[PDB]
Amino acid sequence: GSSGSSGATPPISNLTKTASESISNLSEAGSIKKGERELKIGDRVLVGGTKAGVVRFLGETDFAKGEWCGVELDEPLGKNDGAVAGTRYFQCQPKYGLFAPVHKVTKIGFPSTTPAKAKANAVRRVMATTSASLKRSPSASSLSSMSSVASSVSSRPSRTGLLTETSGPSSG
């Protein structure tokens, strides 16, 4: 190593190993953090029991002192349009973008992971509820059918002529 005149040749080598515990091993900074009560992007959530939106952004806020979840409200119950004191987060319509603490954000559920139930019974993937008539409210329903929009489409600007805009109309 130093007091051996000349010994720059290791005694055989081929087997090696790294890391001692955990699975992480590349760069302790980000990439994969994995939490416990953290929400994911594109997930319906409820806050307070009235405001229900979807996880659009996820990071560290500026006005707060912790990690908040930027959820866009489908209904007019927001405040900012994605911008916060100059800082941009998610591009959405005004009066929709809202920011709330993850711990304060509650989950409602979403259709996707059905098999992953963690309950062995007999058959593969269980799904047999009680055939009832009252679920929660007549207003609330599933995705079976709804009233869509319909109209004639000719596509031919004979009166209109707004090729390029410069000002940008808002009211009217």
Curated annotation (Swiss-Prot):
Processing and modification events after translation: Phosphorylated. Phosphorylation induces conformational changes by increasing the affinity of the N-terminus for C-terminus, resulting in inhibition of its function thus decreasing its binding to microtubules and DCTN1. Exhibits a folded, autoinhibited conformation when phosphorylated and an open conformation when dephosphorylated with increased binding affinity to microtubules and DCTN1. Phosphorylation regulates its recruitment to tyrosinated microtubules and the recruitment of vesicular cargo to microtubules in neurons.
Domain of life according to the entry: Eukaryota
Subcellular locations according to the entry: Cytoplasm; Cytoplasm, Cytoskeleton; Cytoplasmic vesicle membrane; Cell projection, Ruffle
Region called Disordered, residue ranges: 129-166
Signal peptide: none
Positions bearing Phosphothreonine: 9
Subunit record text: Interacts with MTOR; phosphorylates and regulates CLIP1. Interacts (via CAP-Gly domains) with tubulin. Interacts with SLAIN2. Interacts (via zinc finger) with DCTN1. Interacts with TUBA1B, MAPRE1 and MAPRE3. Binds preferentially to tyrosinated microtubules, and only marginally to detyrosinated microtubules.
Protein name stated in the entry: CAP-Gly domain-containing linker protein 1
Organism expressing this protein natively: Homo sapiens
Gene expressing this chain: CLIP1
Parent sequence residues shown: 181 to 339 of 1438
